[PDB]
Structures are given as structure tokens and as C-alpha cells.
């Protein structure tokens, strides 16, 4: 039963809510619909990760980090590597912290994926820009950046 999850997502991108009579933060309803879809149907679940990662008309920032994180941990990790290379100047707080965290964990992998050139400088450029956003602490950005740099000096 996934078309339900897809129609909850379609409504979030359209009106910013999953269903009208839900009293939740609609970003939380959408995160559930997105993660429910990703587990039941990856091919369609990763599609909405992209439909979130490019949409310039979504309320929440957290959910973009969710989408990016889901692609990084999937067989389409390369779509996420190339998204971070080109959009590093525009990526939100949530995406930058999910990027810095993925590569901190990737420092422990036997077989790390090939990292595109300058990506670490583009991320570290973006951190120095977003370091002083008061919302940084809700993503634990300064802590995630500390592990990322101490992993890759």
C-alpha cells in the first residue's frame, strides 16, 4: 500500500501538508510518508528524495537532509555526490550536516566510494558560511564538522 504514501507526498509538495485534517507539523507527516515509501519501493522512494532535493517550494529544511541522507545510503549515492558538488553554495543546514556526517562514517569503510575533487573544500567553504546561523546547533553542525575534520585532516 504505497500509492497512499505517494499521495501524501504529492500533497506536501503542492499545499505543504500531507492531509488537510492532520494536526502534525506537515514536515513530520511527510518524513513518515517518504521513509515509508523508501522501504516499500526504493525506485519510487528515491525519486521523491530527488523531488524534495530540488524543490524550491518546500517549507521544511530537515526533510531535505532526510532526502539527501537516503540517497547517500542507497545505490544512487552518486546522484547525491554530484548534487553536493554543484549545489554546495546553496545547500541548507540540514544537507550540509548530513553530508559531513556521511563522510565521517565513510572514513571507517573498507571500500569508500570515489570522492569528487574539491568536494571537501566546497563543504568546508559552506560550513564557514553556515557556522554562525543560530539554527546550527539543532543539527549539531559544529560537532559533526569536528568529527569530519578530525577524520580527514
Amino acid at each position: 500500500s504505497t500509492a497512499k504514501d505517494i499521495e501524501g507526498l504529492e500533497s506536501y509538495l503542492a499545499n505543504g501538508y500531507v492531509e488537510a485534517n492532520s494536526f502534525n507539523d506537515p514536515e513530520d507527516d511527510a518524513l513518515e510518508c517518504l521513509s515509508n515509501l523508501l522501504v516499500k519501493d526504493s525506485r519510487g522512494g528515491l525519486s521523491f528524495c530527488k523531488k524534495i532535493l530540488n524543490s524550491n517550494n518546500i517549507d521544511g529544511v530537515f526533510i531535505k537532509g532526510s532526502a539527501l541522507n537516503f540517497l547517500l545510503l542507497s545505490e544512487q549515492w552518486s546522484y547525491a555526490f554530484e548534487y553536493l558538488t554543484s549545489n554546495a553554495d546553496n545547500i541548507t543546514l540540514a544537507e550540509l550536516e548530513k553530508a559531513l556526517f556521511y563522510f565521517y562514517c565513510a572514513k571507517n569503510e573498507t571500500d569508500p566510494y570515489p570522492v569528487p575533487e574539491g568536494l571537501f573544500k566546497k563543504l568546508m567553504k559552506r560550513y564557514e558560511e553556515l557556522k554562525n546561523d543560530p539554527d546550527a546547533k539543532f543539527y549539531h553542525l559544529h560537532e559533526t564538522y569536528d568529527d569530519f575534520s578530525k577524520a580527514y585532516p
Binding site: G16, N21, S22, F62, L73, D111, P134
Partner: protein, 321 residues
């Protein structure tokens, strides 16, 4: 003794009583307590005089709660319920009766929970305390009447230039809501979420989240193999993130001098409701500025546009430092 239970239900009630007494499994005793309570409710609500007084939309009336009280006395505090039953004739709380509503809540909380007067007052002056207090009345006066009492206590607590009432949602669940014009605020968004009282056991979610976090750090390739891993971690992370914003919002208003009082929460509801009036799907975001002795705080709100054109508050946020 249980004249309006069937033979089968009498048997189930006795099994529930036994499991309540003998089981060494708290989950089985909790199920048995719920079963005992549901059978007692069927007994009381199947009384012929309770039926007459409580049916066809009258479950919240004073007549309905009074008949239920008579029945419960026959199969056996009663002065606390007397002041409460009288409040069920009220349809709007104003200066005439607000103190009558407050005193009946305070006196009831003392008798039912055994607390002293000052402790009962602090309990009933909160949304979450008053929810527990009204909920504890439901077995005696019935769910509909207990719900009305919670609404009445909400009108008294939040007195200002909006109304308070209960609105059903997608499932038939009641939401206590401040309503004015074509705008609505579910009050828990102000009295719980904005005040740092977001639901969730932070320490439980944090350890379940840190459990998954260490596994992903230990072998990200292995963790990624099953998308259920990343689903559970991301949902825990968001829940934790909502609590942390909820607590930080509470502290922002705290440091500004806008502490957690009914007066302040009511004033905040009223300004937000004004800011939403006549809004459109063009712009669904508003903000107001509130003032305390230590500074101002801007409160941002996003509103859902419902099919009938009214607005319901969806998110409330302050900035941070």
C-alpha cells in the same frame, strides 16, 4: 450487582478482576484494568435511566452525568462531582462563572489525587495537568462530559477575545482549539510545544537513536543494506530535533520574561489568531512580536488553509541564539 451486563460480560469481568489481582505481568494487569473499566462503562451506560438522559447527543449534559452518578452510588467524593455536574449547563465561560469553574477543578483535584490546595491549583492551571484531571472524571461522568469539562476549564484558563472549544479531526479525536473568526489554533501547540513540553521521552529516544548512530559509524555499508535502519534513525532524529526546538523556544520566551502563564499564552493565541484572519493560500506564514521585561520575541506561524477556507495553525517557532 452488575445488572446490565450480559452473562458473557459478567464472566469476562470476573476474569479481569482475577488477572488484576494475580498476574505478575504488569502488561497483562494493564490490559485487565482496561477490560474491567470497559465492562463497567457498558454497565453504567446500559442503565435505562442513563440511556434516557445520555442518548441522542445528550451525553455531555448535566442530566446525563447526574443519572450516571446515581447509578454509581447505588453500586457502592460525591460532593466534588456535584459542583462538577453543575458546570455542564454552562455553554460559555465569562466573569459570571469562571471562578465557579476554577474552584470545582481545584477541589476535585484535591479529592481525586490527594494533593494539597496549592498543588491542585498548579496542576489545574496547565493544559497537560488539566487534561489528566478531566480524563480522570470520564469513568464516572462519561467521556463526553469529561471532554466538555476540559473545554470549560480551557475557556476559564485562556480567557481573552477568542473562544475555546473541541474540534474533531480525521479520526474522531478531540482537539481543544482556540477559535476566532476564520482561524484556529490547537492549544497544545502553544501550551505544550512552544513551552518546551513536546511529547516524547527525550532520554529514551536519545539512546535508541545513539544505538543506531554507533552501528552506522561502525559499518555504514552494512547499515545501508537495509533501508529500515536509516528509516528508524531519521525518525528518531526528527523527534529529538522537535523536542530540542520545543525546549529552545520555551527558553527564548523564558529569558525574555514571557514566562509560562495563562495570561501570556492567551495573549499569544489572540495575536496569532488576529494575524491569520482572512489569509490566503498565497501567503500561509505570519508572525507576531510579543514583549517582555527583558526584550521582544518574534513568533513565526505557518497556517494550513482548510477546504472551507479557514486557517489552522500548523507550526509555531521562535528564533534562537
Amino acid at each position: 450487582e452488575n445488572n446490565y451486563l450480559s452473562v458473557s460480560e459478567k464472566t469476562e469481568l470476573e476474569i479481569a478482576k482475577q488477572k488484576l489481582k494475580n498476574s505478575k505481568d504488569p502488561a497483562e494487569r494493564e490490559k485487565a484494568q482496561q477490560k474491567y473499566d470497559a465492562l463497567l462503562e457498558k454497565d453504567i451506560s446500559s442503565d435505562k435511566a442513563v440511556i434516557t438522559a445520555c442518548s441522542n447527543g445528550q451525553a455531555a449534559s448535566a442530566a446525563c452525568a447526574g443519572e450516571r452518578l446515581k447509578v454509581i452510588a447505588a453500586k457502592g467524593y460525591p460532593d466534588a462531582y456535584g459542583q462538577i455536574v453543575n458546570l455542564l449547563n454552562i455553554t460559555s465561560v465569562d466573569a459570571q462563572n469562571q471562578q465557579q469553574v476554577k474552584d470545582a477543578m481545584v477541589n476535585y483535584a484535591m479529592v481525586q489525587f490527594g494533593v494539597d490546595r496549592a498543588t491542585a491549583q498548579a496542576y489545574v492551571e496547565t493544559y497537560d495537568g488539566m487534561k489528566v484531571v478531566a480524563a480522570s472524571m470520564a469513568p464516572v461522568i462519561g467521556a463526553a462530559a469529561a471532554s466538555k469539562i476540559e473545554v470549560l476549564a480551557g475557556k476559564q484558563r485562556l480567557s481573552n477575545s477568542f473562544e475555546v472549544s473541541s474540534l474533531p479531526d480525521a479520526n474522531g479525536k478531540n482537539h481543544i482549539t482556540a477559535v476566532k473568526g476564520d482561524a484556529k489554533i490547537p492549544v497544545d501547540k502553544i501550551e505544550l510545544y512552544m513551552r518546551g513540553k513536546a511529547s516524547g521521552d527525550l532520554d529514551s529516544l536519545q539512546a535508541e537513536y545513539n544505538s543506531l548512530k554507533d552501528a552506522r559509524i561502525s559499518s555504514q555499508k552494512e547499515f545501508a543494506k537495509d533501508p529500515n535502519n536509516a528509516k528508524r534513525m531519521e525518525v528518531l532524529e526528527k523527534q529529538i530535533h522537535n523536542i530540542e526546538r520545543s525546549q529552545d523556544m520555551a527558553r527564548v520566551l523564558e529569558q525574555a520574561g514571557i514566562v509560562n502563564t495563562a495570561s501570556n499564552n492567551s495573549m499569544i493565541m489572540d495575536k496569532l489568531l488576529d494575524s491569520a484572519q482572512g489569509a490566503t493560500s498565497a501567503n500561509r506564514k505570519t508572525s507576531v512580536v510579543v514583549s517582555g521585561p527583558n526584550g521582544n520575541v518574534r513568533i513565526y506561524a505557518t497556517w494550513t488553509i482548510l477546504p472551507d477556507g479557514t486557517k489552522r495553525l500548523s507550526t509555531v517557532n521562535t528564533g534562537t541564539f
